[PDB]
Amino acid sequence: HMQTQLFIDGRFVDAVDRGTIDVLNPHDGSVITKIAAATAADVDLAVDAATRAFPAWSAMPAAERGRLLLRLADAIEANTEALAQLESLDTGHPIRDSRALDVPRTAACFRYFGGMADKLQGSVIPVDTGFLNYVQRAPIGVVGQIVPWNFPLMFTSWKMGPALAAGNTVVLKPSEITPLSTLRIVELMAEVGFPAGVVNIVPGYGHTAGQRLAEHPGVGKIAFTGSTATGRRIVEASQGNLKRVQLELGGKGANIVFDDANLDAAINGAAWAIFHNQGQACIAGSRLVLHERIADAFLERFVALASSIRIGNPLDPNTEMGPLTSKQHLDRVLSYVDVAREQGGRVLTGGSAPQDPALANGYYVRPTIVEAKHATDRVAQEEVFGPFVTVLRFGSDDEALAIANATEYGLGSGLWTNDLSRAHRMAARIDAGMCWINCYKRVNPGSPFGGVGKSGYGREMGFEAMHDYTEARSVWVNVDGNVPPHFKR
Amino acid sequence: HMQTQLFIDGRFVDAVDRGTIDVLNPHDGSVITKIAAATAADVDLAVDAATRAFPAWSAMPAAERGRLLLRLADAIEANTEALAQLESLDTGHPIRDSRALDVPRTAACFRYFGGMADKLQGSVIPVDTGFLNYVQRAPIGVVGQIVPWNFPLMFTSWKMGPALAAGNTVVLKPSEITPLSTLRIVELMAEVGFPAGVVNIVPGYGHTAGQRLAEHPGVGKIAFTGSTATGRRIVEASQGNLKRVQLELGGKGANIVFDDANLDAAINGAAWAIFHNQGQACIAGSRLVLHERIADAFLERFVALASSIRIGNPLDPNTEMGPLTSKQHLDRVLSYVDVAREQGGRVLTGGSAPQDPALANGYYVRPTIVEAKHATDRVAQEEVFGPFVTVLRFGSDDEALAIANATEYGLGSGLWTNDLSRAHRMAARIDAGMCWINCYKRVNPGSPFGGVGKSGYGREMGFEAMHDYTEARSVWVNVDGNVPPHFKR
Amino acid sequence: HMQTQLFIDGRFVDAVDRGTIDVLNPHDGSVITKIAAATAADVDLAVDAATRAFPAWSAMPAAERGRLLLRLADAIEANTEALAQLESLDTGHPIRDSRALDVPRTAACFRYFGGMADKLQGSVIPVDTGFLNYVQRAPIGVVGQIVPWNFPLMFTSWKMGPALAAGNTVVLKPSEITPLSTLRIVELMAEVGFPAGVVNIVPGYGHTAGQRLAEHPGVGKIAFTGSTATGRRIVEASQGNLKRVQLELGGKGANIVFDDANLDAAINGAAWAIFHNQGQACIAGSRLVLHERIADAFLERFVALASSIRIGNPLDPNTEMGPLTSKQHLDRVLSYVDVAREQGGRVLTGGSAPQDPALANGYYVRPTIVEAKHATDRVAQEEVFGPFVTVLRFGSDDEALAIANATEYGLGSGLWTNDLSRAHRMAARIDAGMCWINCYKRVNPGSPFGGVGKSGYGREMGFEAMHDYTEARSVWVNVDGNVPPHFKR
Amino acid sequence: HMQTQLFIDGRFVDAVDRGTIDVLNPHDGSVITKIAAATAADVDLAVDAATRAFPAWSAMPAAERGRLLLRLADAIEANTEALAQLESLDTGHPIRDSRALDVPRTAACFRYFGGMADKLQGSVIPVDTGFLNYVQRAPIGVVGQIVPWNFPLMFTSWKMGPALAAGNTVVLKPSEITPLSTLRIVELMAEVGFPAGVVNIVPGYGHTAGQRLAEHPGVGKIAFTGSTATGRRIVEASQGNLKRVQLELGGKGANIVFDDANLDAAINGAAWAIFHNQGQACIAGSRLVLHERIADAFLERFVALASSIRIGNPLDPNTEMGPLTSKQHLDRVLSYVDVAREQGGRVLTGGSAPQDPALANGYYVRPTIVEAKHATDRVAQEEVFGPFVTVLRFGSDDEALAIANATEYGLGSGLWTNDLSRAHRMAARIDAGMCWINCYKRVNPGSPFGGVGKSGYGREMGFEAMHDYTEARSVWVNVDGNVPPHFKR
Ligand SMILES: Nc1ncnc2c1ncn2[C@@H]1O[C@H](COP(=O)(O)O)[C@@H](O)[C@H]1O
Ligand SMILES: Nc1ncnc2c1ncn2[C@@H]1O[C@H](COP(=O)(O)O)[C@@H](O)[C@H]1O
Ligand SMILES: Nc1ncnc2c1ncn2[C@@H]1O[C@H](COP(=O)(O)O)[C@@H](O)[C@H]1O
Ligand SMILES: Nc1ncnc2c1ncn2[C@@H]1O[C@H](COP(=O)(O)O)[C@@H](O)[C@H]1O
């Protein structure tokens, strides 16, 4: 049985208003299933359940919370193929990706945080004589999490792993475009023994369920991943009760290839950086910044590789690139081909739907490479979020850095060089939360992930995530302080 | 010579529009001086100066940022008397307090952060074989800081200590009601060698300079201490560029006295907690929560102490309590006495201006103790922010806890008992960022200070403040990762 | 099949000289089995195997080392009954203790360190401009571990958990008196996938296998638990190659009962503190230090409880206390009854073997309580290591502290009081690595465990253990330091 | 007035036996002065004083201990020229080096630790429900420190900075060869307000004062820097009371130059690495390991630079290299020149005293460069500790690594290359506590410094030094643990 209902207080249930949403398969636009569609009243029920569960969940020994997460990681791995199939069906990710990347990264992140739960420690502060001052890292309470459609399975672990490990209870609103793997995950949570109310899943529209969750007076923190524009609306919503906010927003990642780069490695790395996940990744290498000396040779080979990518049915293990996750998103991406040409950009390959008649009803676009004239051009500035890379050239390291920092974003970045000093100097100077040298999109559940500036704030992963999901509770005991009276009598 | 101008890019300067504000002495309403009144255009010049200075300030070794803060601490101590006099003149703080508390706490916090600058360390993450992942704690950039009028001198250290130590440049908007000590502090900063543009001071109205600072696109973080309402406006303003936000908003601190307390210590503690600084402290012990068996005995002594407090001219060394800082605030506090009586509270002492004719022109109110009918009464819920304490009684530990947590605030808290288990159990369960046991208002520059819920987020002091004034910069080096091509050919 | 051979390089093997050691059941003195008896040559083979395995084990991603430990914890839990039966057979621990304490503590500690493996992080140091300095916590290499007979199963986890998680390989010499559970643990390690050579177990005499392991030039650290006198010999042995040393040595724990203690709780706590594990615990509460006001009432009840303890066959689930682990150890304990009487001590209960004829061939002694006249008496100074507690009385808190600190040991300690100040003050002033308030012998795999002074140095458990099983590796990159020549030309 | 007596309990005093030692000027063999010669009885007096002082020193707020170290740093800087002159007179270091390096590094280290004192924090461990477990980092007590003659002034700070910051009291035995600057340091300590007994200085012979200090039952830790043989003797002495031990025991540092190195930087780096301080540095780059393709080129320039180094009177600011510190050490270095030639090494420059007759009575030797026939030759294996470098060549990275790791030492190391992967890969694989890339001998008071294997254990500098100068004190409070009785009745 594929689960399709909301999950509130340990049960699968219909939405209060009995609404549904059609969930589509991006390979052919067919209806996979209808899901229950959470609205404000459902979010209220979910927050109520999380509130009731919080005292017992936070009071549970940290090792006990940890153990549940470990059991969940094992269960995810035991269900790898079914979860991969479901994620591919819903998202359009090639089955080879959901098998090799989506499922294992999800399990690995839950396993990490299972081991992390009882490794977060408080502190003892050296203060005045006769005083003891201990500081706990206490959970916040009920945390609300809003997740987009590009890595829905993976994001269950990135969001919930630290939140739960830290002793918070959760209301998570996954994308209504791709909600199916998230409902399976919570089903597994119940199976391994998560208590009722600790995790509540409320798929529904952003403007119904998402808005209520961000505004809710009983929620202590809202975590959001998506567009910079929607990020602003999350911040606006947080004013009501001054809930804490975490934001992972746009990127327009530079992928810089210097003239001493290993071209083999860099060409493959560039293709990985932008075409993996159909470019639907906030850290995609969407700006390919090529040293003038190697640019022609790089592009000859990179264009040939891109043109060869096998586009097709996500469920075929031979498929290398799937469709985009929605029709609207496909049109968004194609529209940027027109934008690019109007500003004198050259389309080196792709920029249209594939020919194959078997793909005619899916949201497919060919890998697209455009060379732009200036780093200020629209396609060099605006997030396309598809398999679409904009090429720029440079001479000096200073030029490469200026290009890298030329946008409104600062999420990921990376560069290919074999010069020791350059690697570290560039990495320090690029405006980004993450910089990959001679690799790209390396993620690890202990390695802090997030942005600077308009790319948001807060970090997923590691001790950083645990810090962001707890609050300092400072306690002072006056043992022998011998404090003189302030008003002497 | 008393400085009265804006401090921008290393120089004292008039405001662009040449506006001024009158700074009053609360002892008598006299105009001490005009100051230059910063508006948006001055904030822009200040942010520009800070932006220009940031690269060289951030590139300075941490130890040498630290040395400057160390030298500043020494310079403050060397100027103790003159600084104390100026603070007392502006704020109404008794000279005995500005000498013993305001100046020393300010010096201690700068000294702490001077030693802290090169103690903040990054991390190295264990990741896949053949990869090196190091994480720096980099400064944010230009940080904006808005501070109120109750501890202006001390706030310079609480705000600027961590921000500067961490490598940020600063634009600070002190209260236009009490700006004078902050201008002397930045003059000392220049004297000890702070580079031009690293610290910029722009006193002006909230709605001119403050609003622009919070909205400014060149500012990476805004820190605000003051009212909940205004805190919401700071949040709203942050949307433009998604700058990070730190908020310290109201408190309504419970001060709980159990029947096994050392009453001598607790009585003195209670008087310190609410009457020090004329009650103008976010962490004031404004709700005195007394066990029924000892409430009458406690009050008889506490009321006698309170009625004896010597109210008078701040510059008199015998003065124990000064005036409130502004006419507006005094009227507010007197309004709450009326409210208290209106809702059936019993004013046990105080509630009106002192009799002494010499004090007729100043913003004086006597220490005020009111016993409230209910924990839901206005004076038991709303921040009065004056030398005004509301008394409530309880029997059981559970009722003490319920009272303690019955407000919209969660900043500080404390309790007096000699029972081991009760002390730790109550401390864990009270909604507050700080809990003092057998003491109150203990502050130390290493001990994290801030609130939960609508009292805000972020922490002053310690490693916590350094974390909130830096960002994670994760760098990955592929040394020997041997990453297979994603598109195999 | 019960394993009895050495475990070297992934296989169970006989000893080079083909020697054996008889393993006795302390309930009746019968030979359970013969084990292979390691000598110096076998230690050499084990070190060689650990040396060969070290590069691949340390190069393994920390998460993959951690996963092995997690799997081992699960395997131990799945085999709780058989492991408990085996430990009880060999050690004399009541089966109810091996089921409820020995097995679960072993699993919990291995699980903790499995989670810990990829949570240990390096650091990045703020240094001169243009330099990058990162510091790794690298494993030491091959570590030797020598473990006594009182908690042999539990000690496998306490020693091997941090060592392995940190990326060291291990040669462990368990006690030849109680080696059987350790050989089962290593077999489980092989089953869950630990590589050959990573863990090597060499049961044999201290003076053959132990001495060679301590002296071995290829071993980078030796960890020892046991007597202070043998610890000296470990230190001596370490001179050869200046290997690192960790020591947990004698204890003579004070268990202090103030006149405001919960007597119910403290009487039960005292019995647990000394009679659990037949008092064969370094942290046993072997000095019961009683406030004069409560001493008579406490003793009447404590003596009644002690004399009611059900002594019997360890394999009966009704048994509350088993025999001591060896004949020679029984005689040590009994000899101290004579010592106690000669210095005018009074035996309140026990001090002889039980009467039950079924127990005649086992190493059984009744729970023994002696009241000594002075804290300087032999039975108040010398470690007895059996179910033998020495009572002293006191008046003031200062005398209780003086008594507590009157021995040559400093391992564990504890006290029973309800006074908040006293509890923290005493805990700070007592010479010990651990102090339990209103409890005793609380152990947790994150909570550092070890002594001060002659009780040794280093810590089991937590991040402290990880620090002690790694070494700092500092790497400096001069990116842009621009260092002027020292000899200017 | 040059102080020459022992410093014990706040006072300069003669030795109990009234013995003295002659302190020589290495420029001319002349007697600077006689110093008091501590023997065992004086060590006893010093440890007694430190024991008496410990309770009040450890009880002082951390910030107050910190403030004293901060003041000391300033006083050192205020006395730069006189300290530099005294250090140069006693040690032979060129005045330019004592001014630019010895004094500033000493001040910087005390300043770092003065700021560190109140930054070391304890922990709160997540444990069973209803228990609070906090862990303090408490000082050890009285610590003994034994220091050689090569950087005597700097060693005062490296040793005493962390020990004092952490709350220990100190008995320091400086080298009797170069005791004078240490006696001035402790005089400054008294001047800035260090309490009597907190720091005690006992210059005397190793076999009288040093041996007693290492054996003393009142000393909780001994820290020793010097020869391997003497380190073994320290270890042996530690057995008495099982005091903690720290050892820094020499080096035979590889300085590897790859064929892609910046030769200008590397030639200057090599000269600094071995000729600074006359090669009397345990981290000296004493093995120059050169890639075959650049070896001849490098050596032609390096030999020319070395031959040009200006040898002469330490008091002349034009002097670049002074004499060795003692006649005995000079004879040892001259003997190693003979050894080098005996084994077929090629002396490329130096190897004997300079001919200038004004230097005839001093312990002078010219910068000496020997190309060795094999990496196993004596001068390629044994510490010469003079301005003496042994050259070896290689052809693959693996050969360079094999050479690097071919000695019995593992203290410092470094390499010069511009290949990114090689830099980090080689740094990870070299057996050493420290690895410098494109630089050498970079030391910072936050960057841990120490060896592996026979080079010792423990670390100077940073949080690492603070850890090694404290002990974990774990306190458990049973608040609401609800522990069932073990013996159910
Ligand atoms: N106004 C909104 N409030 C809350 N959530 C939203 C809003 N708009 C979209 N979302 C959700 O946020 C995720 C991504 O939105 P976007 O930032 O527009 O990429 C999806 O899961 C949406 O359901
Ligand atoms: N709209 C505003 N935006 C920014 N700052 C303000 C605003 N209104 C007042 N402030 C400043 O915030 C501090 C405390 O404000 P409040 O909490 O409104 O009393 C003072 O320095 C005020 O000048
Ligand atoms: N001289 C020794 N050297 C090394 N290990 C020993 C020595 N004597 C005993 N052991 C082992 O260390 C543990 C406890 O020894 P002890 O503390 O002397 O009773 C047991 O496992 C012994 O086999
Ligand atoms: N047996 C010893 N015990 C303790 N310290 C010594 C001993 N012999 C020499 N020292 C001291 O250790 C430092 C370095 O000595 P060494 O390594 O023997 O050259 C000097 O301050 C010596 O005086």
Please tell me the CATH superfamily of domain B251-444, with its number.
Aldehyde Dehydrogenase; Chain A, domain 2 (3.40.309.10)
Contacts of residue D477, defined as CB under 8 A and 6 or more positions apart, other chains included, come to B420, B424, C423, C437, C438, D131, D132, D133
Q: Are B479 and B131 within 8 A, CB to CB?
A: yes
The rounded Cα A230 to chain-centroid distance in angstroms is 15
Tokens of C430: 């007592």
Q: Are C262 and C438 within 8 A, CB to CB?
A: yes
Helix (H, G, I), strand (E, B) or coil at C247: strand
Indicate left, alpha or beta for B458 from its phi (over 0: left) and psi (-120 to 50: alpha).
Answer: left
**Which-ligand-closest: CA of A208?**
1
* Percentages of chain D per state (helix, strand, coil), in multiples of 5: 40, 20, 40
Name the residue ranges covered by the structural domains of chain B: 1-250+445-489, 251-444
Q: Are A197 and A168 within 8 A, CB to CB?
A: no
Contacts of residue C303, defined as CB under 8 A and 6 or more positions apart, other chains included, come to C348, C349, C369
Closest residue in chain C to residue B116, using alpha carbons only:
C126
Q: Are C438 and D478 within 8 A, CB to CB?
A: yes
User: Does domain D1-250+445-489 sit in CATH 3.40.605.10?
Assistant: yes
Pocket of ligand 1 (CB under 6 A): A 146-148, 175, 206-207, 210-211, 214, 226-227, 230, 233
Beta-bridge partner residues of C145: C172, C223
Interface partners of D (3+ CB pairs, < 8 Å)? Answer: A, B, C
Which residues in chain D have Cβ-Cβ distances shorter than 8 Å to A437?
420
Q: To which residue do tokens 């839950």 refer?
A: A110
Resolution of the solved structure (Å): 1.9
Q: Are A69 and A163 within 8 A, CB to CB?
A: no
Q: How far is the CA of B208 from the centre of ligand 2 (A)?
A: 10
Amino acid at A233: R
Contacts of residue B300, defined as CB under 8 A and 6 or more positions apart, other chains included, come to none
**Ligand 3 pocket, C156 CB below 6 A?**
no
Q: Are strands D122-124 and D131-139 parallel, antiparallel or unpaired?
A: antiparallel
Amino acid at D291: H
Tokens of A49: 């359940």
Helix (H, G, I), strand (E, B) or coil at D282: coil
Which residues in chain C have Cβ-Cβ distances shorter than 8 Å to A119?
115-116, 119, 446, 463
Integer Cα distance of A199 and A169 in angstroms: 6
Contacts of residue C215, defined as CB under 8 A and 6 or more positions apart, other chains included, come to C237, C240
Integer Cα distance of A333 and A387 in angstroms: 8
Amino acid at C405: N
Annotated binding residue C227: yes
Integer Cα distance of B314 and B92 in angstroms: 6
Chosen for mutation from C242, C267, C301, C477 (greatest number of chain D CBs closer than 10 Å) is C242
Integer Cα distance of D347 and A405 in angstroms: 54
Q: Cite the active site residues of A.
A: 248, 282
Q: Cite the active site residues of D.
A: 248, 282
Which residues in chain A have Cβ-Cβ distances shorter than 8 Å to C424?
132, 477, 479
Contacts of residue D340, defined as CB under 8 A and 6 or more positions apart, other chains included, come to D347, D351, D370, D372, D377, D378, D379, D390
Integer Cα distance of B278 and B319 in angstroms: 12
Q: How far is the CA of D215 from the centre of ligand 3 (A)?
A: 24
CA distances, B79 to each of B86, B178, B193, D308 (Å): 11, 19, 17, 53
Q: How was this structure determined?
A: X-ray
Integer Cα distance of A466 and A117 in angstroms: 9
Neighbours of D293 (CB within 10 A): 13
Q: DSSP strand E in C211-296: where? A: 221-225, 244-248, 254-257, 287-291
Integer Cα distance of B147 and B162 in angstroms: 15
List the one residue out of A371, A331, A333 whose CA is nearest residue A349: A371
DSSP state of D449: B
**Ligand 3 pocket, C230 CB below 6 A?**
yes
B/e letters for D172-197, b = 16+ CB within 10 Å, e = fewer, are: bbbbbbbbbbbbbbbbbbbebebbeb
Tokens of C165: 């998680």
Q: How far is the CA of A233 from the centre of ligand 1 (A)?
A: 9
CA pseudo-torsion sign A126, A128, A134, A138: negative
Q: To which residue do tokens 């950086």 refer?
A: A273
Indicate left, alpha or beta for B205 from its phi (over 0: left) and psi (-120 to 50: alpha).
Answer: beta
Interface partners of A (3+ CB pairs, < 8 Å)? Answer: B, C, D
Alpha-carbon distance D424 to nearest alpha carbon in chain A (angstroms)? 9
Q: Which one of the listed residues B248, B371, B383, B460 is annotated catalytic?
A: B248
Amino acid at A474: S
Neighbours of B11 (CB within 10 A): 12
> Count of H helices and E strands in chain B?
16, 20
Q: Are strands D11-13 and A434-437 parallel, antiparallel or unpaired?
A: unpaired
**Tally of residues, chain A:** 489
List the one residue out of A385, A1, A2, A6 whose CA is nearest residue A173: A6
Q: To which residue do tokens 């002390």 refer?
A: B423
| 3-state SS string for chain C | CCCCCEEECCEEECCCCCCEEEEEECCCCEEEEEEECCCHHHHHHHHHHHHHHHHHHHHCCHHHHHHHHHHHHHHHHHCHHHHHHHHHHHHCCCHHHHHHHHHHHHHHHHHHHHHHCCCCCEEEECCCCCEEEEEEEEECCEEEEECCCCCHHHHHHHHHHHHHHCCCEEEEECCCCCCHHHHHHHHHHHHHCCCCCCEEECCCCHHHHHHHHHHCCCCCEEEEECCHHHHHHHHHHHCCCCCEEEEECCCCCEEEECCCCCHHHHHHHHHHHHHHHHHCCCCCCCEEEEECCCHHHHHHHHHHHHHHCCECCCCCCCCCECCCCCHHHHHHHHHHHHHHHHCCCEEEECCCCCCCHHHCCCCCCCCEEEECCCCCCHHHCCCCCCCEEEEEEECCHHHHHHHHCCCCCCCCCEEECCEHHHHHHHHHHCCCCEEEECCCCCCCCCCCECCCHHHEECCECHHHHHHHCEEEEEEEEECCCCCCCCCCC
List the one residue out of A398, A339, A347, A352 whose CA is nearest residue A370: A347
Chosen for mutation from C64, C71, C118 (greatest number of chain A CBs closer than 10 Å) is C118
Q: To which residue do tokens 């520009």 refer?
A: B48
**Which residues of C touch chain B, with CB atoms under 8 Å apart?**
59-63, 117-118, 120-129, 132, 134-136, 417-421, 423, 437-438
Q: How far is the CA of B408 from the centre of ligand 1 (A)?
A: 29
Helix (H, G, I), strand (E, B) or coil at A268: helix
